[PDB]
Design a protein around this ligand. Sequence first.
Ligand code: AI8
Length: 419
Amino acid sequence: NAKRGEIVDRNGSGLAINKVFDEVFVPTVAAATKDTESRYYPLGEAAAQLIGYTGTITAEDIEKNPGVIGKTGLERAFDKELRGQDKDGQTIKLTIDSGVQQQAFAIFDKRPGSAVITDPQKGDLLATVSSPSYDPNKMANGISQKEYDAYNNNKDLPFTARFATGYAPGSTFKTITGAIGLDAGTLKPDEELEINGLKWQKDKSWGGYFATRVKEASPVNLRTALVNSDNIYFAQQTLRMGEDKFRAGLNKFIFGEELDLPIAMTPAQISNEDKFNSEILLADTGYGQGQLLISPIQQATMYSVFQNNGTLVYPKLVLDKETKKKDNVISANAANTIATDLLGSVEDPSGYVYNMYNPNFSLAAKTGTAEIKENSFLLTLDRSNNKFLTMIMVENSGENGSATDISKPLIDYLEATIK
Ligand SMILES: *C(=O)[C@@H](NC(=O)/C(=N\OCC)c1nsc(N)n1)[C@@H]1NC(C(=O)O)=C(Sc2nc(-c3cc[n+](C)cc3)cs2)CS1
């Protein structure tokens, strides 16, 4: 009987450890009584999808590769290192910070959504949160059929790891579209484009389709369009760029690329085919619509270029793993120009993230709402020290509110701890 290896956070705090209990004769916590060692998760629901839970080796388990075994999450993906022999399992230290993990999970409060917080210059995943969640301690050490069925019958599906699920990125994708337009030469950041009305189309060939916007602006430049959430500006800049210049910039990212993370995840895609085959879809992809499917972990990876002078860093979950990058995904001037203009989302009183304004901290942000019901997104960038990046989403934002409405405790926590 060898002890299973432990999973600890970046500071050594236990994420999946062993603890002896007095159980109520074979094993609730106090027939008979005996001191039995049990697999314990201190963060509970806050890290349930990431860490996973254990279970007994079933018949079909040993029927593949010849008392407890990882059934899901990192407890399953890291089983060979944590199981050991009968040699104690080794301890695997992650990049997670327990303080940030419990902050990101607390802001949702049963709301469906996800949140990832990274170190945009190292790739360290400080937190990967999916809501709603479940009790991993109950699932591993005996859960009743009343709480299991309560989890299965939940229409929001608490078992799914939403940080590894592909969604449409929303208007936050304009940051990439605008940066590609800058390096292409077609998008001048200071030229004033005349945009009139709340709807726009290229010509009569679009028919009953229009690019719609919210706030009416008179001449819209790059900085104003990002703060005003103007779809028409980026649509016109996408049509001006052409399918080739736009796809040339997008292909420098990690689309269709499998990552070395120990989290199962479908690679990000641009569209179903190698070509757009239309022009309304080219405009849609310009402002985050179309057939884009990027996961929160992949979204945090792509957007890391703005805090590394255009260099993309890959996400890492194990601490001692070497930092991997993809150099020159966008220019340094393009990354800095977009990151500087995004300060207006927080600092401008008319900005949509002005509720999080802090005069002693530079925070660039960008909102986004996608129609799939509608989901809300929020990307924030530490421009004071480039030490954290957030990607927060809330599913069914028409009923559960926007991501900005609940993310203020999270952002305030990071600015004081990670700084
Ligand atoms: C990018 O996200 C854009 N989104 C859309 O065009 C889509 N839906 O619009 C929802 C109304 C859409 N369909 S599919 C898909 N993938 N995306 C723009 N991004 C923004 C944003 O979050 O800033 C939205 S919502 C918005 N709401 C306000 C507002 C209005 C009034 N008041 C008092 C305050 C705030 C500004 S923007 C739409 S467009």
